[PDB]
Symmetry: C3
């Protein structure tokens, strides 16, 4: 019972799901109890074909059937799922819900300033996506092209991603905080034919330089033929380069409210997302179409317990994977509304999150612990002014959640009435790897709990490289077989992909994290083993900041390390200009 290795586990009482969770859920839970979950998990590991085939058919709409559920091995880095099938991401995210119920809300958009907020129905979303896709189609964008998006977290970002997917092209989303150099790097690696951006952004009430950073970068991006610019502020003084830049409203007005979607293969790339890595310049993680979408829908449904009546508020940015999977694809695939928040938790005050939750009766809230630390320090008193009784599932993402914050999250936001899901995963996994299912798995504060369907977690001894049998163990966290939403390569550098994930421990997937497993099987994430730092949920490379500093001629040598920080979890102008303010 007492753990000599897993010190986190000693004397920690299991936390059962509160009664209010089950009272508030609109329908019967998808899994009755933890024992049914283990039966389903055991099948998803021993019999992936008989487990994932039927779910793929239930949760996704197929234009062509698949003939093989699963192919490939980690060691050969040739994993593939639902081979021979064809589908379209935007059809599954928009069309089929629009045909069923066109007036159902899809994008609940909360602007930096609430006066500018608006809601798009699934019918509205189909017309806007079709028109932007029509613009891209007129420009020669076609299956196989890549299109960059440089937009803040608002409706137009979702529409751009979905419009690119409609044509069979792959979107490459670039966080609005990146510098012109970071834009240049990503656009050139992917050889994007087109870019979608806006004139300016609004964050915390302050104007943001968007188009200007694009122009500075594009002088070195010869592959970009055309740019679509949305008028977020409609500032007249913002310059558009003639013959290359065109206005969103002007061009979409030229095209009809329906455009047929384009079928792609299960294993055609849905998108590229450039993550910072221990070695080298940022690398474009590639995700397939079928496997990624299934992983997104499946995890959204089962870990968060999402039903059609529910509303999900993921306080993330599509510049990162959390927005991709659980702000856009996960919820829309399931046909529920998703809340897209452009602003910050502090503007106009530290009750903004709670105003939104009360306003739209959100049932699920998904945020990074860094925000919880901020609200604990500055905004605790406002929580009580807003009605949060609509929530039943509260999620944590992107970094460890200390047991103290877990309790703060549970009581002050959850009112000790909600289920807390500490979701462990990474950009390369596509979706959740270890997380406690809402309404099924009791919680240990700070523990990611059991691994998800199709995730065969294991601990390896770093020095011997041998998998660690038995519980009460510590080691590098690895997976013993690939899973549907696993990233398939790094764009045009599959060798980097193999050397990073598959080759260090042959037969395994290397998460880059160390973890611990206790006698109950709960996993405790102990953090990166490599030189990758996590600052406020943002993944950074110590090499990239060291490179930015050395770029300055005055610098002889540079060395970067990470330390504990109570607000953010973990020459200055040179690093801001090389990488980004964050």
């Amino acid at each position: 019972q007492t753990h000599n290795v897993v010190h986190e586990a000693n004397g920690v009482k299991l936390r059962e799901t509160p009664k209010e969770f089950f009272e508030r859920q609109p329908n019967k839970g998808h899994i009755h109890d933890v024992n049914q979950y283990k039966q389903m998990y055991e099948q998803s590991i021993k019999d992936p074909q008989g487990f994932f085939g039927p779910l793929a058919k239930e949760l996704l709409s197929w234009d062509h059937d698949f003939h093989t559920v699963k192919s490939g091995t980690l060691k050969n880095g040739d994993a593939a799922w639902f081979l021979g099938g064809e589908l379209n991401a935007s059809y599954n995210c928009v069309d089929r819900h629009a045909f069923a119920n066109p007036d159902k809300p899809a994008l609940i958009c909360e602007a930096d300033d609430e006066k500018d907020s608006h809601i798009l129905t699934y019918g509205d979303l189909l017309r806007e996506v079709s028109k932007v896709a029509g613009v891209l189609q007129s420009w020669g964008i076609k299956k196989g092209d890549t299109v960059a998006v440089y937009l803040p977290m608002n409706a137009q970002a979702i529409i751009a991603m979905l419009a690119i997917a409609r044509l069979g092209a792959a979107h490459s989303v670039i966080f609005a905080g990146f510098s012109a150099g970071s834009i240049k790097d990503r656009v050139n690696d992917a050889s994007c034919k087109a870019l979608i951006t806006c004139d300016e952004g609004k964050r915390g009430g302050r104007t943001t330089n968007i188009k200007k950073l694009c122009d500075e970068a594009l002088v070195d991006c010869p592959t970009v033929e055309k740019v679509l610019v949305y008028k977020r502020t409609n500032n007249p003084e913002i310059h558009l380069t003639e013959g290359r830049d065109y206005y969103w409203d002007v061009e979409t007005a030229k095209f009809p409210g329906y455009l047929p979607p384009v079928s792609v293969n299960s294993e055609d790339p849905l998108f590229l997302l450039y993550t910072s890595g221990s070695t080298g310049t940022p690398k474009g993680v590639v995700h397939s179409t079928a496997g990624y979408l299934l992983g997104a829908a499946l995890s959204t449904k089962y870990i968060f317990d999402i039903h059609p009546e529910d509303i999900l508020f993921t306080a993330g940015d599509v510049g990162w994977i959390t927005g991709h999977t659980y702000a856009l694809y996960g919820p829309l695939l399931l046909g529920v509304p998703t809340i897209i928040f452009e602003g910050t938790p502090a503007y106009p005050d530290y009750g903004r999150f709670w105003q939104i939750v009360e306003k739209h009766k959100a049932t699920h809230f998904y945020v990074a612990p860094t925000a919880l630390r901020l609200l604990r320090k500055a905004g605790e008193q406002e929580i009580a002014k807003y009605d949060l009784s609509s929530l039943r599932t509260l999620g944590s993402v992107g970094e460890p959640i200390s047991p103290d914050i877990w309790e703060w999250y549970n009581e002050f936001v959850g009112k000790n009435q909600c289920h807390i899901s500490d979701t462990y995963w990474q950009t390369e996994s596509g979706s959740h790897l270890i997380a406690p299912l809402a309404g099924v798995v009791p919680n240990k504060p700070g523990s990611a709990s059991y691994p998800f369907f199709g995730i065969d977690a294991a601990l390896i001894d770093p020095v011997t490289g041998v998998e660690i049998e038995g519980n009460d163990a510590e080691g590098v966290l690895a997976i013993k077989d690939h899973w549907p939403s696993m990233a398939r390569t790094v764009y045009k550098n599959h060798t980097k992909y193999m050397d990073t994930y598959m080759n260090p421990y042959p037969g395994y997937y290397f998460t880059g994290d160390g973890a611990a497993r206790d006698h109950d099987g709960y996993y405790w994430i102990r953090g990166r083993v490599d030189d990758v730092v996590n600052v406020s949920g943002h993944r950074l490379s110590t090499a990239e900041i060291e490179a930015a500093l050395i770029e300055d001629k005055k610098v002889s040598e540079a060395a970067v390390v990470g330390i504990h920080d109570d607000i953010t979890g973990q020459l200055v102008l040179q690093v801001r200009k090389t990488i980004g303010p964050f």
Copy 2:
């Protein structure tokens, strides 16, 4: 019984279909009587899914099934039919019939001079279409491209259109009578990658300059990469530009008689057709084809044994729908007439009908008036007893012309189908079904399947219930063959058809409905601007302004406005307010212009 509004209907006896019609039709009619037609029509309006789904499966061959029969609304201009389905126009018009009976005639071509007439079987058509598609494919034409056609009404025009559709590209057919300026405008708006044409044309025994006008246009058409030139006259003096112009016979000889067709989406554009600044009406693939086949079958009573002679030009919608797509989809021969009704003499139409024993004849009243004036004696010289359905298209047919048509051509033995429709509708909207609907001469009669016809008051925009009424002719829901957009100007599409009377399709015509429900087309309306629900006449404002002695002349136009829908701009601070007050007291308070080629400058 007496009409107080629809004066045309007073004292008009219904004219039953003659017995010789049913004696001559090869099989039992597709609809038994007017009551069965009413049942089918009510379903096509109340239950479009359960009506059109089965017909789409019966009449068309699908490469991929559709999952939704009908989508969209007029007001959002996002109409779509048979979503998720894939098919090919040339496969449904050529391939499937060629496999069934390759020797059945497909294109009965009558040349300007009969010596050059010839017949192509469906097998022949498949080979010629395959070869032209092979030429275009080797040239890089692919799905998404547009290809212009500048050809007279002959086999090569049909072959080009089907070959372009075979690859998934959209053909944009340009009437051979158009000038170089008209060619340039259309080619550049569609950004065509290739052009198919001929060296010279023959009309009325006279040579027409075709390639020369193309060359004149292409100096300003940089998107045109290659031209395919047919040797219609084989004139040695006609020059071909090296590296751009290639001969039809030379290139088609290089490629085989089969080329796989390329599947497209139901809602992929089949073709662009520029209305007579010119705007490119776009038609979908599945919806347009179903409308063409369905109307041809039921309005005209077409069976596999029949032969159709549509005396129209593929430069216009009538040729597209009822000279090519309609009849070929159903697998019947179609007569493609290159020349004029007068050359070599004014009996040419009737010689053709006699020669090929055509059962169906479709012509415009303009031609009927000409032949009445100059060739009436010639009709009796020929055997026309093979005809049973006589169609009128494109303009009103007066009761006198209707009677002349019925007696001198029909011998009082045929059914007459006065077909009302437009380029944007793709196919028939109001027309009397052959053998089913008794007609009133000068009346198109009942609206067709999927066409929910209505009359709206021009001032209020409110639908006029009840019969013995007059108003703007509108449609209450979209239909499969309805045009989907104006090429790269969907705003003009909405402003023209969907915005003037929201929730309706605006035909631009006025009509009247009598106590029996028959519609009487009264012709184009004044096309009144709509500013925030107040409908205004630009002509009335020009007149009110001209009444002012200070005004030299006045010209008023309408443009799109983001707040009020349409805006009125007047071309002619004390005099501007004096003119605005002149318009308010002459016309009305809500008729004052927003401000005082003219449309494009106003729209910037």
Copy 3:
């Protein structure tokens, strides 16, 4: 019983399949008896829809079903099969078998030197094909493009072909024996966007220049954007042109081991294979996808009696049609291992074929009679060193097999215990046309026997142009309807296709061969009627050789003809007249020069057996050369020239005769 026309058939005892064949056969045979074969054949002729439709569904994996089994006619040149259907060639050859059993051997690669041999499983092949296709995809290769392959007979050539097909593009394979000019001709006609090759080759233990010949040709191939070079010898001295040439290993390392295959239409072109004809320029025969693959699978399965347990050794090169169909597509479609031999039958000794068979326990062996003649002359002693008891089907391809060689093949290789399948067919047929099915059809040595499924064979009278009813006949060999794997066109020259195959005998396919049919219906191939030479199984154009000789400025005129050869079947004799040279000292000096001219223009294998220097070539009143005179003289039929008064230069004939006598053997 006695034949009055078909003398080959007189006094020829039928040879039943040995009993050992069925003992060695792993399962029940695919065909019950010859009567079942006759019934199936009749249905394949009278009811092609009900016969081939079901077989196409059994043997191929379809991405879209077909709606019409068969379309078009020979006379119109618009043949088509399985219309509306979609599939992918590399999926049916690799993916589907890899998913079933990833570890099963697929490519048994035997290198020029056995130390370098290796085996690729179907899983290995899927990853390698996926990676090469990934490189081509990154380079912009897409459905509709053509890609040239210039590689020896080894794994990388197979991988290249399958990777190109995976993307929906058509491969055009160029035999490694071709010179730079022949590469240039083929690459430019097809307008290939990319080329796949290697640095150097190994044959008979000697290094061959491969990339060097590509570089020479590519200076005049402006359509080629990028080249993929495999490191066969990894010789550092081989130069790669910057911006165009990239190494196979470096680029494939950038892309993953799975790439989704691209659906193509049944009638989208699978490949171009440039054949020589009676033209003087090679013509690119085009093959469809569905029909060709079905033909490959069907003939491999039924003519050779291939089961999943079997191992096929086709001793051919993918540079030619035999390698395409029966070294790559046939066996891989059926999911069995296939042996890819890079070297020669003689290196390191004349037992190499048999070493390979014994090493891998091959069950089927497929070779050209030219090789049999070589091993009979030089390597007969080697046979006894090897265990050949794993073989049961022995095939002959590409040229007539004399009854003596048929017996030699039967005794020393087969041990009088195997079935022998003399397969008649050609590049344009895609697959076997007339062949005795293994375990079903009794053999007459030297006879291809009965026509195969879907092949309605006929003999036409050379004089009347009328089909010959009844047996004991001879005439032009023609086919009365098209068949699935028939070539569909000549690339961008459909007129040459029609004039060559479909127009000469309207309503028929013209094989270019003459044949005879005996009282039993067995067909006896009597050889080309269109003056097309076959040297050691290589199809050559005498016109193309004349052109190469004329390129030499010393040459005034050239006339090339074919004669019988005891080693190579047919040999090429070149008669040359020189502009300004009657010098007898130059004699052999310029004869070698001319031979080298042919070697550098076309390739070493096209080199003439002999060059005859003459003062004048015999010509007509119009001035055309009379090649019949040269044929008869070279065949030692000097008599049988007949009246030569019709020549403008009858006196030239005597000089030709004496020139041949004085120069042929020396």
